[PDB]
Design a protein around this nucleic acid. Structure first.
Ligand SMILES: [K+]
Ligand SMILES: [K+]
Ligand SMILES: [K+]
Ligand SMILES: [K+]
Ligand SMILES: [K+]
Ligand SMILES: [K+]
Ligand SMILES: [K+]
Ligand SMILES: [K+]
Ligand SMILES: [K+]
Ligand SMILES: [K+]
Ligand SMILES: [Mg+2]
Ligand SMILES: [Mg+2]
Length: 1317
RNA sequence: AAUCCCUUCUGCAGCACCGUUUUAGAGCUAGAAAUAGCAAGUUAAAAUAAGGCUAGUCCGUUAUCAACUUGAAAAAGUG
DNA sequence: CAATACCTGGTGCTGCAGGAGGGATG
DNA sequence: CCAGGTATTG
């Protein structure tokens, strides 16, 4: 009674099957619990678990940081109001009270309804004088008169509440925003600065070029093109890119700018290369540009002046437009200016029409009339009838608002002393930001917090530097997320640029080098002293060590050789002692670097230089070693910084020692007799204690629950959910088998609204490219789902193999080609595809695109890569011909990869299963592997199905998952029975090119007959593995079984309370209050809450004026918001809902997808408290499935054999009317959608003359009507069938509730009809 | 299971711009009223998961969940 | 009550830490 | 986008 388990793991399903020795699926009588007449039921041991996808914690994060930002903006306003409190009380004792209650209706207000002044005359006068807040801001900046304290507060609060971005570190001169004069002065500085050949700025419109709204690099390209004799990589072009916003490097010219550390960066660069006024004229021009796009001798507040310009132009253009429409088109006036439902001005101001929609609506009306030329120019400039609060204000830096705030404070502190004293406090309120390396300012109740306090007191924007330890917190920010050595899980990894780590890497690479001379018969390793000599003579004198250097400067000059051959390294050594030479240049003391005593200190310094990024903290930590280096060396040292972390810790590299030998890993790597064992051999050697000590280190950390362990894997949270469910399914199956472990467990893992991503990728690439391909051809995200159009836009409308424009309309004429041919690699993704007019122009179809195409198109390809329209992998594959093209080894590897699962995630799943199955040790204290775990790629079973006609159709039902599992079980098991030597490739354990190509290509031919023998056996054992006369019949019978255990995981719904839309007030009890006292009838609110789970209530409710008690049984949906209160005390909750005399013990909790069975096997699932999903699977017989498969698609190019498939399709055409029949009988029994079924029958009767292929495809479409789960709309040819929904859950209150275990084999059935009174 | 770069998949932190909602921004004239004819419109306040106690410039949408017995829970046991 | 149609919150940026896989050694 | 909530129309 030996058995094996087959598993198919996916992101929404775990298919499972149990097989015996003969590849049969058993069947058992399983006990049934509950109050039903049924006491047991027969189940086949095969099925599939279905579940909704597990989501990422990202949306939670975004919304959580937003919650924090709203809290902190409120606290900003609260600080500002606290500063104003007393003097405002002297002026107006209820001003802030009216501000906070501005949202209430006049009936609910406690003070006068006019907020600012408290009476109508002064309010109307204010709005007449200051129609927008920016009028008041400009007035308060420019005027010299004492102003009302309330208007001052309103201006300062409007600046602080919407304060602009923080993308620039430094100050901003308010004026000097003339692009032209700053570019001219830059040109003068360069010309009189440089030695000869002065640059030309004659007839240049640096203003237009730089100020045009464009990508930084495209404006760079334009300005460079204007300059004769200047490269885009020219030094002056580099300075221009510095001024534009890019980071240039003057390293190559002489062998973001806004970062704060970037100025220290520039200072050390100046130390390295010894006039900079062009830089002081470069960032000045950067300001000029950035400011000029947004906005100076007439005011100190130019931003509010620009907003007032917006307002004035809006007024003038609106007057002109009203007059023009009244004169020329008097009949549309209402529609344009009164109808909020239309996208005219009325919908633009009061409706829901955006600026873009309003423009789309009014462009034809402007083109239709006369005198609309300037208005149309403003429209195409996106500068017509503009509001002031718009989407594009994200460009406004906080320095602008800060300048206006400071101006107002300077004006009004002459009249208000508390403004003079609190000026810097208010400025700080505006400018203060919590640093990213500090995190939440918590006190021990935030699982995300790491900040440590210098003193225990409340943190404010002003005492932040004294209360918050900006030092220790910035250290914790990195150290909490630092990686731990996998071998010693309680040790921190070394910095990637640590001297010890680089020594380790160099010695590990060097210890496997071999060399041959004439005197030697066979190659030899390098001795420890040879390796030390090579390190001291070469690695410590050159950054990179070439094989030529190894042959000449060592084997010739030391060992006195003339011809020696080297193996283990080719051309140049990959490892290098980079930090050694960095420090040798900085400190200039080789004996200090070579003194082993000085290792520690150095490891400290580098650690600092890696751990932090701030200059002050780095200097503070390096102070401990100030006495060791001259001041110049200390300044050069603090300017140097590293990033990145290694994979191994210091204790593993050079700490733990082998008990017998007494030396560390690095000691072995430096000298290991004549074995020269490397790191892997060291930690896997049974004669050394490294293996055992690593084992003893691992265990203590991994004593935690299965869920935590699976959380610690790397992968999508959806596939992690799948993995956890897979493990639980295996546990349940083992329990079903009488706690006997299986012989094999075969696992296969499937491969892994993105249209907006395509749109964003293309928009960014085209605007960075500076192309007008979207002005010429506007496109929507739905059109980008077509492969050819997406390729067209990614290629800027050009052929990729030949210099020639592409025509959009002729996309059907063109070809989509694989960069690496698909006979070699089955890559069908954008990363390996190209749109070209004719694939013939690629060159030869058997390799990488020819060298000629590369020579033609490399520059255009590089332009596409810089705009991120192609990836780096795509570019490399396109230009592989430059580096020899595809070698035969690549040919063999592309095929071995198609059939050997080499993912770390499938390896992790197999390791979990293996460590859960095999737990006993033998007499030699080695593991007893009772259970072998196999990992297969989906292509094996896919090719099996296609070769032996066991086709899958995903749309018919969810059975295929289960079937896949079964097939996986079968094939895998058979495979390792036929070729045990392949265990190393497929079974979890710590155990010519043409040859392996042929072998892996034909690995699955033992199943085929063509003459191979009828019976296939193992060569050595003589055991039978496959009977071609009997076992295929077994597989067919298994795939034809109608009873398959499909179980949809019942899940409590979590997440948001409801839809987020804040609806207008409405006389409906469906509205939910947004605050405790905000009656939705007066204020609006939310609707559409999500039911966490429903509850079966059995009680009485009052009926009629008499309040008589009437017995009821109904489903009450507990919403996500109600859940905590209902669970704290269900009886009080239900009584508050209106129920009386609740039968507490009859309360049944019903999560989403709870299963009910009614009459004639009709099943329903709970979609919520008031809707049901389809609960039955349509078990279509196998012959119909294979017919639908074959007839669904043409058979073209064993193409002569495909004639037999076509003849079978045509000989069994009557199958169509049978399939429809099978559907009809199903629907009438189970679905109960009379109108939809009649429409579908009429549609099938309508197209009986259509070709068989298209009828088959639309019949595939039909199964949406019968699929398990929520109803969905579908299409039969050109007829649309809307979903028939189940808008009532009354019937399930008398049906049979079915509780299912994870496999569905164990059940518990409750006949709810026995509940009532 | 080397380094570099790229891509993709994950986790955390700090910000910005809108959108919505109610109220404020005296609508006028003729109508009994409905309605008609005109004037106007760009701005602001406040909320932005109800809220919680642990009162922090903190926390509140991920992960986990058939039934039944035990347990605070994680989880074990039951065919 | 059952069929029918409509609805559904978005965008942009800065830093950091990691797993992976692909292609090459800048 | 999918699919559960909502009002409107019978
Ligand atoms: K009142
Ligand atoms: K040029
Ligand atoms: K609008
Ligand atoms: K090399
Ligand atoms: K760093
Ligand atoms: K959910
Ligand atoms: K959940
Ligand atoms: K279940
Ligand atoms: K990465
Ligand atoms: K790698
Ligand atoms: Mg709040
Ligand atoms: Mg607003």
């Amino acid at each position: 009674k030996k058995y094996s388990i087959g598993l198919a793991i996916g992101t929404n399903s775990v298919g499972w099957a149990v097989i015996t020795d003969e590849y049969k699926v058993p069947s058992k009588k399983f006990k049934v619990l509950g109050n039903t007449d049924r006491h047991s039921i027969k189940k086949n041991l095969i099925g599939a678990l279905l579940f909704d996808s597990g989501e990422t914690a990202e949306a939670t994060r975004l919304k959580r940081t937003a919650r924090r930002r709203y809290t902190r903006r409120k606290n900003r306003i609260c600080y500002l109001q606290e500063i104003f409190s007393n003097e405002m009380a002297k002026v107006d004792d209820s001003f802030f009270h009216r501000l906070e209650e501005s949202f209430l209706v006049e009936e609910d207000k406690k003070h006068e309804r006019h907020p600012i002044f408290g009476n109508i005359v002064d309010e109307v006068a204010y709005h007449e004088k200051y129609p927008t807040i920016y009028h008041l801001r400009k007035k308060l900046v420019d005027s010299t008169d004492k102003a009302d304290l309330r208007l001052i507060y309103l201006a300062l609060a409007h600046m602080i509440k919407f304060r602009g971005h923080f993308l620039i570190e430094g100050d901003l001169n308010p004026d000097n925003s003339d692009v032209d004069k700053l570019f001219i002065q830059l040109v003068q500085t360069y010309n009189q600065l440089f030695e000869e050949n002065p640059i030309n700025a004659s007839g240049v419109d640096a203003k237009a070029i730089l100020s045009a709204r464009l990508s930084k690099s495209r404006r760079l390209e334009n300005l460079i093109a204007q300059l004769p004799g200047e490269k885009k990589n020219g030094l002056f072009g580099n300075l221009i890119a510095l001024s534009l916003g890019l980071t240039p490097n003057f390293k190559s010219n002489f062998d973001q700018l806004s970062k704060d550390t970037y100025d220290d960066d520039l200072d050390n660069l100046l130390a390295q290369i010894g006039y900079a006024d062009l830089f002081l004229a470069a960032k000045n021009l950067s300001d000029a540009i950035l400011l000029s796009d947004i906005l100076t001798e007439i005011t100190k507040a130019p931003l509010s002046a620009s907003m007032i310009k917006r307002y004035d132009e809006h007024h003038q253009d609106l007057t002109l437009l009203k007059a023009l429409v009244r004169q020329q088109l008097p009949e549309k006036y209402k529609e344009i200016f009164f109808d909020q439902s239309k996208n005219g001005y009325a919908g633009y101001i009061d409706g829901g029409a955006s600026q873009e929609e309003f423009y789309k609506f009014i462009k034809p009306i402007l083109e239709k009339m006369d005198g609309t030329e300037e208005l149309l120019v403003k429209l195409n400039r996106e500068d017509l009838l503009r509001k002031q609060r718009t989407f594009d204000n994200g460009s406004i830096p906080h320095q602008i608002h800060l300048g206006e705030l400071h101006a107002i404070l300077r004006r009004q502190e002459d009249f208000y002393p508390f403004l003079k004293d609190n000026r810097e406090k208010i400025e700080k309120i505006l400018t203060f930001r919590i640093p990213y390396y500090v995190g939440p300012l918590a006190r021990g109740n935030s699982r995300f917090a790491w900040m440590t306090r210098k003193s225990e007191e409340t943190i404010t924007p002003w005492n932040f530097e004294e209360v918050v330890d900006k030092g220790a917190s910035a250290q914790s920010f990195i150290e909490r997320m630092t990686n731990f050595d996998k071998n010693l899980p309680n040790e921190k990894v070394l910095p990637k640029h640590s001297l010890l780590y680089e020594y380790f890497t160099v010695y590990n690479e060097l210890t496997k080098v071999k060399y041959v001379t004439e005197g030697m018969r066979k190659p030899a390793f390098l001795s420890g002293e040879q390796k030390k000599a090579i390190v001291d003579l070469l690695f410590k004198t050159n950054r990179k060590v070439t094989v030529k250097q190894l042959k000449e400067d060592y084997f010739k000059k030391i060992e006195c050789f003339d011809s020696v051959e080297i193996s283990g390294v080719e051309d140049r050594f990959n490892a290098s002692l980079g930090t050694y030479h960095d420090l040798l240049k900085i400190i200039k003391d080789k004996d200090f670097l070579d003194n082993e005593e000085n290792e520690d200190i150095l490891e400290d310094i580098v650690l600092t230089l890696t751990l932090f990024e701030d200059r002050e903290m780095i200097e503070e930590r390096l102070k401990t070693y100030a006495h060791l280096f001259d001041d110049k060396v200390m300044k050069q040292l603090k300017r140097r910084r590293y990033t990145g972390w290694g994979r191994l810790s210091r204790k593993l590299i050079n700490g733990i020692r082998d008990k017998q030998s007494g030396k560390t890993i690095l000691d072995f790597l430096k000298s290991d007799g004549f074995a020269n064992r490397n790191f892997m051999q060291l930690i896997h050697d049974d004669s050394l204690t490294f293996k055992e000590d690593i084992q003893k280190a691992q265990v203590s950390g991994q004593g935690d629950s299965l869920h935590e362990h699976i959380a610690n894997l790397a992968g999508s949270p959806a596939i992690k959910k799948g993995i956890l469910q897979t493990v639980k399914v295996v546990d349940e199956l083992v329990k079903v088998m009488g706690r006997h472990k299986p012989e094999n467990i075969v696992i296969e893992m499937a491969r892994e609204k993105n249209s907006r991503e395509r749109m964003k990728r293309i928009e960014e690439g085209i605007k960075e490219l500076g192309s007008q391909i979207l002005k010429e051809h506007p496109v929507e995200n739905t059109q980008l789902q077509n492969e050819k159009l997406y390729l067209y836009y990614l290629q800027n409308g050009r052929d990729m193999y030949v210099d020639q424009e592409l025509d959009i309309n002729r996309l059907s004429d063109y070809d989509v080609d694989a960069i690496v041919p698909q006979s070699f690699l089955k890559d069908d993704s954008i990363d390996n595809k190209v749109l070209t007019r004719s694939d013939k122009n690629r060159g030869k179809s058997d390799n990488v695109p020819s060298e000629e195409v590369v020579k033609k198109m490399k520059n255009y390809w590089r332009q596409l890569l810089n705009a991120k329209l192609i990836t780096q992998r795509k570019f490399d594959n396109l230009t592989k011909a430059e580096r020899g093209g595809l070698s035969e080894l690549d040919k063999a590897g592309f095929i071995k990869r198609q059939l050997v699962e080499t993912r770390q995630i499938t390896k992790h799943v197999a390791q979990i299963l293996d460590s859960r199955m095999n737990t006993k040790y033998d007499e030699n204290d080695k593991l007893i592997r009772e259970v072998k775990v196999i990992t297969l790629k989906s292509k094996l079973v896919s090719d099996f199905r296609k070769d032996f006609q066991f086709y899958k159709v995903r749309e018919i039902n969810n059975y295929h998952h289960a079937h896949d599992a079964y097939l996986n079980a079968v094939v895998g098991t058979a495979l390792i029975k036929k070729y045990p030597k392949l265990e190393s490739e497929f079974v979890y354990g710590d155990y010519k090119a043409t040859a392996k190509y042929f072998f892996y290509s034909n690995i699955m031919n033992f199943f085929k007959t063509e003459k191979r023998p009828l019976i296939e056996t193992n060569g050595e054992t003589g055991e039978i593995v496959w009977d071609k006369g009997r076992d295929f019949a077994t597989v067919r019978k298994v795939l034809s079984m109608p009873q398959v255990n499909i179980v949809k995981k019942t899940e409590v719904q979590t997440g948001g309370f409801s839809k987020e839309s804040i609806l207008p007030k409405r006389n409906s009890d469906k509205l939910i209050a947004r605050k405790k006292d905000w009656d939705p009838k007066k204020y609006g609110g939310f609707d559409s809450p999500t039911v966490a789970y429903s509850v079966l209530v059995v009680a009485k409710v009052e009926k009629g004026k008499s309040k008589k008690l009437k017995s009821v049984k109904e489903l009450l949906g507990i919403t996500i918001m109600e859940r905590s209160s209902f669970e704290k005390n269900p009886i009080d909750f239900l009584e508050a809902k209106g129920y009386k005399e609740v039968k507490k013990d009859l309360i049944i909790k019903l999560p989403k997808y709870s299963l009910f069975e009614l009459e004639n096997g009709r099943k329903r699932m709970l979609a919520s408290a008031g809707e049901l999903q389809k609960g039955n699977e349509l078990a279509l017989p196998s012959k119909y499935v294979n017919f639908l498969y074959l007839a669904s698609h043409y058979e073209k190019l064993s193409p002569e054999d495909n004639e037999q498939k076509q003849l079978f399709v045509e000989q069994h055409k009557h199958y169509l009317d049978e399939i429809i029949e099978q559907i009809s009988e199903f629907s009438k029994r189970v679905i109960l959608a009379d109108a939809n079924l009649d429409k579908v029958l009429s549609a099938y009767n309508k197209h009986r003359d259509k070709p068989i292929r298209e009828q088959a495809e639309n019949i595939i479409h039909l199964f949406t009507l019968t699929n398990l789960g929520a109803p969905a709309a579908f299409k039969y040819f050109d007829t649309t069938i809307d979903r028939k929904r189940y808008t009532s859950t009354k019937e399930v209150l008398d049906a049979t509730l079915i509780h299912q275990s994870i496999t569905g084999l164990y059940e518990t059935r409750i006949d709810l009809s026995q509940l009532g009174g």
